[PDB]
Curated annotation (Swiss-Prot), chain A:
The gene is KPNB1. Residues 334-419 are annotated as: Ran-GTP binding. GO terms for cellular component: cytoplasm; cytoplasmic stress granule; cytosol; endoplasmic reticulum tubular network; extracellular exosome; extracellular region; ficolin-1-rich granule lumen; membrane. The modification N-acetylmethionine is found at M1. Mono-ADP-ribosylated by PARP16. Keywords: Acetylation, ADP-ribosylation, Cytoplasm, Host-virus interaction, Nucleus, Phosphoprotein, Protein transport, Repeat, Transport. It is found in: Cytoplasm; Nucleus envelope. Belongs to the importin beta family. Importin beta-1 subfamily. One of its GO terms (molecular function) is importin-alpha family protein binding. Disulfide bonds: none annotated. It holds the Pfam family IBN_N. It comes from Homo sapiens. GO terms for biological process: astral microtubule organization; establishment of mitotic spindle localization; mitotic chromosome movement towards spindle pole; mitotic metaphase chromosome alignment; mitotic spindle assembly; NLS-bearing protein import into nucleus; positive regulation of cholesterol biosynthetic process; protein import into nucleus. This is Importin subunit beta-1.
Curated annotation (Swiss-Prot), chain B:
It comes from the Eukaryota. Induction: Both the unedited and the RNA edited versions are induced by butyrate (at protein level). Only RNA edited version is induced by DTT, vinblastine or TNF (at protein level). Belongs to the histone H1/H5 family. It is found in: Nucleus; Chromosome. Histones H1 are necessary for the condensation of nucleosome chains into higher-order structures. The histones H1.0 are found in cells that are in terminal stages of differentiation or that have low rates of cell division. Residues 1-74 form the H15 domain. The modification Citrulline is found at R19. This is Histone H1.0. The chain holds residues 24 to 97 of 194 of the full protein.
Length: 873, 74, 619
């Protein structure tokens, strides 16, 4: 109202906030704009998200007395309507004037304009913005910044999900396309407007008029772009531009694509540059990204996957000339030592792969010989290079050519891995690993073994500093395991002692590996964990001595993880922590995968500490809903045992958790954990009622808000209610009352949805009555306390039962409880009237309907219940 | 109740009749305009993607990890 | 599940009633005669269903039902066995119900009913029946009931892991003196141990005992050991590490076996030996094959001896069969068999030299057995003599002739091109001599198809006689081999004949014609294309067109000559009736590319038909 008291006090949420506060936010905030254009505009900057008219209007409007009533539903638009500045149409047109003028470097208005889409979302449509924007776009003062500045509104407008058809705007856009392509721009930014403008207008489909002339312009764009480096990402705009061509090829004839082919040759011709020129060196990195485009350019013609448009494109026919180019492209040589990082280069490798697919005719004759040419004159870099290239060769079986070439490779390759440098062998090891999985015809099992034997023990020295490659060699050994599974017959009976001791060493190495000195490479902690899991899978009947220590190590890791977990560090950490935690879970299930009678008691024993720690920290930390929940699951998976002490420990935390307000919604998580511990012990039921009644009491208020957590709770409470056996009659009366109370409780609508599942809610009430029935005598004179309520219980049920009984959608459980209902209520009610006997057939048809089922079982008992149902006279 | 994270992702992938699936950005901004949202969408959602990968829902297509393009298995 | 009682849950009343009837029958025994149980089969058949009916009503939980059932078969059989047998011998009595239990079990597996414990109760009961007969039907019964009973108990209901048999035990003790052998034999006969991927140490001791069994003074003793040995080796095994060491004596015993002759199962074990032969550890295996080659020398020596007393066709077949087991594992090791094949050819030649067989059984066996043979020029040289006889043999009986004739053509494969060096020509003349209406015989449809097919195979690259062959054979064939019975064979034969070399027929046939071209056939073909839509060839109810037409439509050529008829033809079959990605992109381009001008004639109709055809084809 004044002094920010309403602006600040009003901010706190209150009942009917959109309706009353909305007058303040939408009308008052909106109200400020007519009096002062400046204050309202000033208003966007301090709290862009916090706009009473829009931000307040937007979420408070979505939930309302009427979920979807225009007169009743939106006050943000009405409130703003009073103030000219506040108006939704004023929002559009004024958003244009203010938003364009006040670019202010990064723009607050753009989000507001985007909200413009969101807030206007309640209204069917807004037509105010286009005429002025169109006029602005065609405005005489065509400033370079202004010409480029326009469309910020257009871009976000394109982004909005709602679809409307505008054509005059499309015509203006076409004019812009021709003029922009036509106009020369010396500043990267203006064309960036061209590119981003295009991609957003590209959308999924284009209503723009057809002509292939503009694309030719793209070809030209490369040449001048050759002269100036600009922005690596500006260049990205060029690469993206062609990529735009990649998405769509409307006319094959139109898309001659001669310029692209010509451009590739010139670029190919300008392979780097003589003497490594700098414009060219930057061009080489950008060229690498562009090269990613290059693979696409090669990919465009003769693609393997089904495509809308497929053609030689003048390249496959020219492949003969282009046959040489793949070998020629090799003009660029790199001596850099990196194993796990690709960046622009991966694109290089994939491009090589596409040529590999497209090799067609003459590839087979060339392949045996190509290796020989490299083999005849192989340099130290070349052999290592030969290995990387061979890795390119991996794709394509080349069966006639490959065996002789591969067979000599075993001999040739073997005199190579013993290179002295720690890094050179590692290079051999990774490429060798890919080959190893790749090749089964050649057999160096004996040849493979010395290195494996050597790798397991000898290659631990280089492990501490950047020893990931030694690990990579280990990964290769794991592949050796897979290859053994799929390479040649048998040979699975030897090397076990070697495996037992080496793996025995691996596991200890892992923890420090995870926190080991950085190589920042394609080495995965998660991947490492997966490798460990695979090794465990390869585990024998017993590896218990390792496992206890392993679990403790995990405990040490958990403590380290907890230290990382307790105080975060800017989120770079947040994620580096989180993924590694996911692997920690991998550890947890992996440790408990095996099960032995002797083993379980021992493992559970030491496990007790861990479980407890989880509870402590899990209850205490309050950081992740599923991580902690998952911890509950894994520790929870420890079925059986003396759970009286542990389970007893669980209830206060469970009761406390329900009481706890850390998470806005905790019902789904709460339901899952209980639905397991609840199952384990039923002999003593004393602990549950105290926390449960409150939780039960707490649930009714909670129930209105969520539909999903209703039937499950109704079913869950039924499960607690499920013991029956003529016990908890007092509780049973309350339980019976609760079902009535649940029916009595007011309906709740969430996300503009109310009672979506008629069956679960309606049936849920059916289940709930039955639950009281098991707890409470299906003969308790005062079955229903209330008179109004009583007619339905007393007389409504019999009439309703005939209709319901003849009714269908009989669930496997509602059907079974009902099966009990027929006999028990039936004997007492037997002889009430001819009508019960007479009205029986309607029930019979539904029972016949119930009969169709999958794997139905136990007719005897149901038959007995029905016998009681018909036990008449 | 609360919509399942997997559901959201399934709907987003399936809403685009496409082969290469989509850049997470598409699903994420889709979430931004189509659903209730919070500051931790990237961390909790991203981890959710990671977890739906762990459940084996999806097959990789382009990229590596939750930054890429991916397709359903059939 | 099983129908034992009326309505729902009736199954139960009948099974109780049967037990009650036994009790009523039990109080007074009027008959006091054997074979009383057999008369109860109608009742016995009724009883399993009734028991099933009680479980079916109750639908008792499988774990509880299984536990009850596990206690129950033994408890009721035992309670029933303890009372029924006294008031009804034991062994006979065990069998009908045992067989009946078998009947229940076969039905049970599909049903998934849970049972357990049939086997454990029996070992003790097994004690009850001696199962020893020196030379009476008694032995027969021992065979039938004991071995079968043990196998069933071990593998279906009892699911036992390990057992010690006292009856098995006496025989092990005190060597082979006296009875232990009589007892041991019964024991072994009645059981084979069943294990998965397990070495058995008792089996190792059994191998040493097998050596002692080899040292058996008498053949009958050797026989009782032999059945066990034959199955035992025939039985597949997880390890058999000491088996190779064990094998030489067995092989050495095999040697004595050739001299010893005697048992057919022992000779059959040789068959088992081949199976055992693929094994694991193939490279040494070759050296075993060479020793087996010396044993094969014995086999070659053996056949006449086998011929002299009791024929052992299997043994003759087995030498050939055994190589294949070696074929089973491939180490790429150089094969020394070539020379062996030469020996086989010499042996084969001796039978061939006589050129006759009174039985007309051994000759076919030699042929099919001998089908795998060297294709070397000498092997190549052998076929004309083999084929020359083949021409004589095929002609006398068409039915007898066809399987061999197909083989005779396969034999013709070595000759290959040039009609096997002009022999193909001899075969055609012989066929002409034996080709006619006489030829239609059960399977003639197939037979005539085969004959024509044979010709086509010879004519891999025999374009010149081909116009005459299709045309000449057909004119003669329609009158001579045309039959109402063979129309189904004929349509496919006609379609296939028409289907084969259509272009060669279309252009080369059109270009050069002897006695012109088959205008009637061409007229018939034109009518036939329309006719196919109207009438189903071979009375297949349209099965053939859809199946081949799938892959076939893109590849096959019918579009240019008579597209309107073909266009009219395709839908009717479909109405009556009811790899790809690379091919689909490639096919439109490929078909269009080789003759762009040619498609043009059927360009609109072809394209319209194609779009519809593609949808029908891929729909």
């Amino acid at each position: 109202m004044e002094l920010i008291t309403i602006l600040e006090k009003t901010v706190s949420p209150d009942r009917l906030e959109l309706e009353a506060a909305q007058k303040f936010l939408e009308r008052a905030a909106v109200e400020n704009l007519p009096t002062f254009l400046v204050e309202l505009s000033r208003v966007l900057a301090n709290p862009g998200n916090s706009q009473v008219a829009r931000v307040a209007a937007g979420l408070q409007i979505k939930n309302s007395l009427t979920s979807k009533d225009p007169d009743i539903k939106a006050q943000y638009q009405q409130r703003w309507l009073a103030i000219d500045a506040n108006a939704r149409r004023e929002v559009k047109n004024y958003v244009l004037q203010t938003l364009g003028t006040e670019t202010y470097r990064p723009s607050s208005a753009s989000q507001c304009v985007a909200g413009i889409a969101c807030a206007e979302i309640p209204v069917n449509q807004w037509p105010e913005l286009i005429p002025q924007l169109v006029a602005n776009v065609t405005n005489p003062n065509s400033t370079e910044h202004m010409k480029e500045s326009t469309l910020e509104a257009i871009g976000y407008i394109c982004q909005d999900i709602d679809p409307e058809q505008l054509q005059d705007k499309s015509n203006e856009i076409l004019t812009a396309i021709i003029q922009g392509m036509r106009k020369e721009e010396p500043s990267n930014n203006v064309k960036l407007a061209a590119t981003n403008a295009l991609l957003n207008s590209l959308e999924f489909t284009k209503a723009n008029f057809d002509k292939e002339s503009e694309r030719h312009f793209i070809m030209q764009v490369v040449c001048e772009a050759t002269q100036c480096p600009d922005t690596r990402v500006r260049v990205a705009a060029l690469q993206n531009l062609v990529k735009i061509m990649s998405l769509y090829y409307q006319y094959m004839e139109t898309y001659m694509g001669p310029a692209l082919f010509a451009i590739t040759i010139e670029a190919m011709k300008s392979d780097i540059d003589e003497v490594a020129l700098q414009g060219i060196e930057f061009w080489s990195n950008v060229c690498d990204e562009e090269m990613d485009l290059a693979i696409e350019a090669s990919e465009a013609a003769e693609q393997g996957r089904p495509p809308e448009h497929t053609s030689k494109f003048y390249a496959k026919g020219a492949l003969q000339y282009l046959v040489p180019i793949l070998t020629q492209t090799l003009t660029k040589q790199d001596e850099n030592d990196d194993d796990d990082d690709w960046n622009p280069c991966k694109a290089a490798g994939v491009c090589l792969m596409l040529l590999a697919t497209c090799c067609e005719d003459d590839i087979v004759p060339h392949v045996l010989p190509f290796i020989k040419e490299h083999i005849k004159n192989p340099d130290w870099r070349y052999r290592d290079a030969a290995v990387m290239a061979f890795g390119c060769i991996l794709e394509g079986p080349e069966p006639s050519q490959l065996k002789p070439l591969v067979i000599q490779a075993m001999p040739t390759l073997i005199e190579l891995m013993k290179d002295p440098s720690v890094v050179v062998r590692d290079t051999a090891a990774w490429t060798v690993g890919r080959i190893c999985e790749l090749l089964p015809e050649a057999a160096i099992n004996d040849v493979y073994l010395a290195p494996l034997l050597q790798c397991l023990i000898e290659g631990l020295s280089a492990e501490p500093r950047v020893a990931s490659n030694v690990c990579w060699a280990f990964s290769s050994l794991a592949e050796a395991a897979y290859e053994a599974a799929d390479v040649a017959d048998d040979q699975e009976e030897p090397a076990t002692y070697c495996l037992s001791s080496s793996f025995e060493l691996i596991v200890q190495k892992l923890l420090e590996t995870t926190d080991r000195p950085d190589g920042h490479q394609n080495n995965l902690r998660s991947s490492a964990y997966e490798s460990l899991m695979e090794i465990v899978k390869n585990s024998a009947k017993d590896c218990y001595p390792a496992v206890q220590k392993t679990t403790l190590v995990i405990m040490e890791r958990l403590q380290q993880v907890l230290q990382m977990e307790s105080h975060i560090q800017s989120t770079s950490d947040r994620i580096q922590f989180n993924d590694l935690q996911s692997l920690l879970c991998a550890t947890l299930q992996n440790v408990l995968r095996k099960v032995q009678h002797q083993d379980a008691l021992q493992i559970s024993d030491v496990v007790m500490a861990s479980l407890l720690r989880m509870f402590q920290s899990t209850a205490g930390s309050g950081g992740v809903q599923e991580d902690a929940l998952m911890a509950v699951s894994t520790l929870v998976e420890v079925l059986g045992g003396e759970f009286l002490k542990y389970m007893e420990a669980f209830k206060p935390f469970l009761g406390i958790g329900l009481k706890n307000y850390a998470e806005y919604q905790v019902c789904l998580a709460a339901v899952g954990l209980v639905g397991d511990l609840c199952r384990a012990l039923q002999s003593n039921i004393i602990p549950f009622c105290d926390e449960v009644m409150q939780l039960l009491l707490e649930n009714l208020g909670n129930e209105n808000v969520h539909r999903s957590v209703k039937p499950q709770i109704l079913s869950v409470f039924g499960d607690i209610a499920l013991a029956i056996g003529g016990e908890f009659k007092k509780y049973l009366e309350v339980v019976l009352n609760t079902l009535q109370q649940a029916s009595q409780a007011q309906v709740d609508k969430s996300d503009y949805d109310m009672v979506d599942y008629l069956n679960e809610l309606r049936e849920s009430c059916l289940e709930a009555y039955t639950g009281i029935v098991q707890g409470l005598k299906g003969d308790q004179e005062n079955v229903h306390p209330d008179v109004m309520l009583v007619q339905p219980r007393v007389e409504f049920i019999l009439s309703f039962i005939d209709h319901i009984a003849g009714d269908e959608d009989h669930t496997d459980g509602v059907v079974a409880c009902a099966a009990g209902l027929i006999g028990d209520l039936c004997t007492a009610f037997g002889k009430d009237v001819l009508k019960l006997v007479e009205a029986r057939p309607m029930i019979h048809e539904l029972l016949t309907e119930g009969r169709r089922s999958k794997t139905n079982k136990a007719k005897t008992l149901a038959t007995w219940a029905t016998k009681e149902l018909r036990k008449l006279k | 109740d609360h919509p399942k994270y997997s559901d959201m992702i399934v709907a987003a992938i399936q809403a685009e009749k496409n082969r290469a699936g989509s850049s997470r950005q598409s699903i994420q901004k889709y979430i931004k305009s189509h659903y209730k949202v919070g500051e931790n969408a990237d961390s909790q959602i991203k981890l959710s993607i990671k977890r739906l990968v762990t459940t084996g829902v999806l097959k990789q297509t382009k990229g590596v990890g939750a930054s890429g393009s991916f397709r359903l298995a059939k | 599940k099983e129908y034992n009682d009326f309505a729902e849950v009736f199954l139960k009343a009948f099974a109780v009633g049967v037990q009650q009837v036994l009790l009523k029958v039990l109080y007074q025994y009027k008959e006091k005669q054997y074979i009383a149980p057999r008369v109860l089969q109608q009742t016995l058949n009724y009883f399993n269903q009734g028991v099933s009916h009680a479980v079916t009503w109750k639908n008792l939980k499988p774990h509880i039902q299984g536990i009850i059932q596990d206690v129950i078969f033994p408890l009721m059989c035992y309670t029933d066995s303890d009372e029924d047998l006294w008031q009804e011998d034991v062994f006979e009595d065990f069998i009908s119900p045992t067989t009946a239990a078998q009947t229940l079990l076969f039905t049970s597996c599909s049903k998934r009913k849970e049972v357990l414990q049939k086997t454990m109760g029996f070992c003790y009961q097994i004690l009850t029946e001696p199962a020893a007969d020196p030379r009476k039907k008694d032995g027969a019964l021992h065979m039938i009931g004991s071995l079968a009973e043990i196998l069933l108990k071990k593998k279906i209901y009892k699911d036992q892991m390990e057992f010690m048999l006292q009856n098995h035990v006496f025989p092990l003790f005190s060597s082979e003196l006296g009875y232990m052998r009589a007892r041991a034999c019964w024991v072994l006969h009645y059981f084979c141990e069943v294990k998965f991927k397990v070495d058995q140490n008792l089996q190792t001791a059994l191998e040493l005992t097998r050596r002692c069994l080899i040292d058996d003074r008498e053949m009958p003793v050797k026989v009782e050991a032999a059945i066990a040995l034959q199955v035992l080796i025939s039985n597949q095994e997880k390890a058999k590490e000491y088996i190779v060491p064990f094998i030489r004596p067995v092989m050495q015993a095999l040697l004595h076996i050739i001299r010893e002759t005697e048992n057919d199962d022992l000779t059959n074990v040789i068959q088992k030996m081949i199976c055992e032969y693929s094994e694991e550890v193939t490279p040494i295996a070759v050296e075993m094959t060479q020793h087996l080659a010396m044993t094969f020398n014995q086999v070659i020596q053996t056949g006449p001896d086998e011929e002299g007393s009791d024929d052992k066709a299997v043994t003759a077949m087995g030498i050939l069969n055994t190589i294949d087991t070696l074929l089973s594992v491939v180490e790429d090791h150089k094969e020394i068999t070539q020379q062996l094949e030469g020996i086989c050819l010499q042996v084969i030649g001796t039978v061939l030299q006589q050129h006759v067989l009174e039985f007309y059984e051994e000759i076919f066996s030699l042929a099919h057995s001998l089908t795998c043979q060297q294709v070397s020029p000498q092997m190549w040289q052998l076929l004309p003599l083999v084929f020359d006889i083949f021409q004589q043999d095929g002609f006398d009986y068409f039915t007898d002739m066809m399987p061999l004739l197909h083989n005779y053509v396969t034999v013709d494969t070595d000759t290959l091109l040039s009609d096997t060096k002009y022999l193909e020509m001899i075969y055609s003349m012989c066929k002409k001599i034996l080709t006619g209406v006489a030829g239609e015989d059960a399977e003639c449809h197939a037979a005539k198809l085969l004959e024509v097919v044979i010709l086509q195979c010879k004519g891999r690259g025999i374009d010149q006689v081909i116009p005459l062959f299709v045309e000449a054979a057909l004119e003669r064939l329609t009158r001579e081999v045309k039959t109402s019975e063979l129309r189904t064979m004929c349509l496919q034969v006609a379609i296939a004949a028409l289907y084969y070399s259509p272009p060669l027929l279309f252009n080369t046939l059109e270009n050069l014609r002897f006695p012109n071209n088959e205008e009637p056939v061409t007229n018939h073909f034109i009518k036939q294309w329309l006719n196919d839509v109207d009438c189903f060839l071979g009375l297949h109810d349209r099965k053939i067109c859809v199946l081949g037409l799938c892959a076939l439509i893109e590849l096959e050529q019918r579009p240019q000559v008579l597209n309107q008829m073909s266009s009219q033809i395709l839908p009717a079959f479909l109405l009556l009736f009811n790899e790809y990605q690379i091919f689909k992109a490639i096919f439109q381009k490929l078909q269009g590319r080789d003759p762009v001008w040619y498609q043009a004639l059927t360009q609109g109709l072809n394209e319209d038909q194609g779009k519809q055809l593609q949808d029908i084809a891929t729909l």
